[PDB]
Write an enzyme that holds these catalytic residues in place. Structure first.
Site, short mmCIF file in Angstrom:
data_model
loop_
_atom_site.label_atom_id
_atom_site.label_comp_id
_atom_site.label_asym_id
_atom_site.label_seq_id
_atom_site.Cartn_x
_atom_site.Cartn_y
_atom_site.Cartn_z
N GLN A 196 18.01 80.19 23.51
CA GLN A 196 18.20 78.91 23.71
C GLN A 196 18.13 77.97 22.38
O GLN A 196 18.76 76.78 22.48
CB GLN A 196 16.89 78.21 24.60
CG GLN A 196 17.22 78.38 26.05
CD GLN A 196 15.97 78.05 26.74
OE1 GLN A 196 14.95 78.36 26.69
NE2 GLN A 196 16.12 76.95 27.76
N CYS A 238 10.44 83.63 32.34
CA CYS A 238 9.65 82.47 31.63
C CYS A 238 9.85 81.23 32.37
O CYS A 238 9.71 81.51 33.92
CB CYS A 238 10.36 82.28 30.19
SG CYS A 238 12.23 82.03 29.97
N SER A 239 10.16 80.14 31.78
CA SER A 239 10.29 79.00 32.83
C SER A 239 11.91 78.94 33.41
O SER A 239 12.01 78.99 34.62
CB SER A 239 9.91 77.52 32.24
OG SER A 239 9.73 76.45 33.08
N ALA A 240 12.72 78.77 32.41
CA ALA A 240 14.20 78.81 33.02
C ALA A 240 14.73 80.35 33.16
O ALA A 240 15.83 80.42 33.80
CB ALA A 240 15.05 78.05 32.01
N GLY A 241 14.03 81.15 32.55
CA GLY A 241 14.72 82.75 32.61
C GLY A 241 16.01 82.81 31.71
O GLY A 241 16.76 83.51 32.00
N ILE A 242 15.97 82.13 30.60
CA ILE A 242 17.19 82.46 29.63
C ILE A 242 16.87 82.57 28.02
O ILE A 242 17.30 83.36 27.27
CB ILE A 242 18.25 81.30 29.75
CG1 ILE A 242 17.90 80.03 29.45
CG2 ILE A 242 18.81 81.39 31.33
CD1 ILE A 242 18.79 78.84 29.59
N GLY A 243 15.62 81.98 27.62
CA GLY A 243 15.17 81.85 26.38
C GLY A 243 14.34 82.79 25.96
O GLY A 243 15.00 83.66 25.30
N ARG A 244 13.02 82.63 26.14
CA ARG A 244 12.00 83.82 25.71
C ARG A 244 12.56 85.21 26.46
O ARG A 244 12.41 86.37 25.80
CB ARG A 244 10.64 83.31 26.28
CG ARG A 244 10.02 82.18 25.42
CD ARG A 244 8.78 81.86 26.03
NE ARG A 244 8.57 80.60 25.75
CZ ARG A 244 7.30 79.91 26.05
NH1 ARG A 244 6.49 80.28 26.98
NH2 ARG A 244 7.13 78.56 25.62
N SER A 245 12.95 85.08 27.74
CA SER A 245 13.25 86.02 28.60
C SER A 245 14.56 86.66 27.67
O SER A 245 14.73 88.27 28.07
CB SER A 245 13.75 85.63 29.99
OG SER A 245 12.93 85.12 30.97
N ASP A 284 3.33 76.67 22.44
CA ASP A 284 4.18 75.52 23.15
C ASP A 284 5.56 74.98 22.55
O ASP A 284 6.50 74.81 23.20
CB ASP A 284 3.08 74.49 23.40
CG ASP A 284 2.50 74.36 24.56
OD1 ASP A 284 2.26 75.56 25.24
OD2 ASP A 284 1.76 73.35 24.86
#
EC number: 3.1.3.48
Length: 282
Positions: free
Chosen positions: A262, A215-222, A181
């Site tokens: 991010q 992912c949630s925004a599509g920029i970090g983990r993605s 998390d």
């Protein structure tokens, strides 16, 4: 510089935040005018994460062709990816329309539906074989075929049917379930094992449309996922693997979608993953 020793040099000097801020300063800025039209406000999860107009995916619909999704096309590596936000209640039908129209084989999901006590994306696939989903706005049917639950990730086989033409296709859902998390994983070992499972399936290969990753925004983990994959592929292709410059690759990718990676912790983790993955290759 090489990667592994540049890495230790940033650790010993504790300058990850300064490196990361340089990237943010140098990153491309292109217009995202379609994303900011008033009719598309409920199609965006976050007001500061938008696809550039030059690289956005267009739905094949004449009313409104907008989805928050971008085509990252890596020329030297010969890999393409579609990065997108986690679907919203009013965009689950658009999401599967995109998967169909772009001929994708696989969907990569790097978040859980609920994190930190809040909803990070819609429950957009069926959880029981005998309870299929119909998306009436885009005329698609989706059925769970099988599910294989492992300790760090789950793989699902899905059937997607275009109800207009009665064509059917098999889609693979690769769901990484254990990202914490807060922060990043302590070891890249399970993330790399996950990437190799996606590769082995054929979902990343040229005989299919681009993989859809979110992912949630599509920029970090993605961003971490495609940056690591591209960097490892280049280290296999080039005569001199130490020439691969992860910061340069990240800046190339940010020509196609804003904000990839991010935090400075995600940047450090991306270095770690590429350093460890290269060995396992041989």
């Amino acid at each position: 510089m090489e990667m592994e020793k540049e890495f230790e040099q940033i650790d010993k000097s504790g300058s990850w935040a300064a490196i990361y801020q340089d990237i943010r300063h140098e990153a491309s800025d292109f217009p995202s005018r379609v994303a900011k039209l008033p009719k598309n406000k409920n199609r965006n999860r976050y007001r500061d994460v938008s696809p550039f107009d030059h690289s956005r995916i267009k739905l094949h619909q004449e009313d409104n062709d907008y989805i928050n999704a971008s085509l990252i096309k890596m020329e030297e590596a010969q890999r393409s990816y579609i990065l997108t936000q986690g679907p919203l209640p009013n965009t689950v039908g658009h999401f599967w329309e995109m998967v169909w129209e772009q001929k994708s084989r696989g969907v990569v999901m790097l978040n859980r539906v609920m994190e930190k006590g809040s909803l990070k994306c819609a429950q957009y696939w069926p959880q029981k074989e005998e309870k299929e989903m119909i998306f009436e706005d885009t005329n698609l049917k989706l059925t769970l075929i099988s599910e294989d639950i492992k300790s760090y990730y789950t793989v699902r086989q899905l059937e997607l049917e275009n109800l207009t033409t009665q064509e059917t296709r098999e889609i693979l859902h690769f769901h990484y379930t254990t990202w914490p998390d807060f922060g990043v994983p302590e070891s890249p070992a399970s993330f790399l094992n996950f990437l190799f499972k996606v590769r082995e399936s054929g979902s990343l290969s040229p005989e299919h449309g681009p993989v859809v990753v979110h992912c949630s925004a599509g920029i970090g983990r993605s961003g971490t996922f495609c940056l690591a994959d591209t960097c490892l592929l280049l280290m296999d292709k080039r005569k001199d693997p130490s020439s691969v410059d992860i910061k340069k690759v990240l800046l190339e990718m940010r020509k196609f979608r804003m904000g990839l990676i991010q935090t400075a912790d995600q940047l450090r983790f991306s270095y770690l993953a590429v350093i460890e993955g290269a060995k396992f290759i041989m």
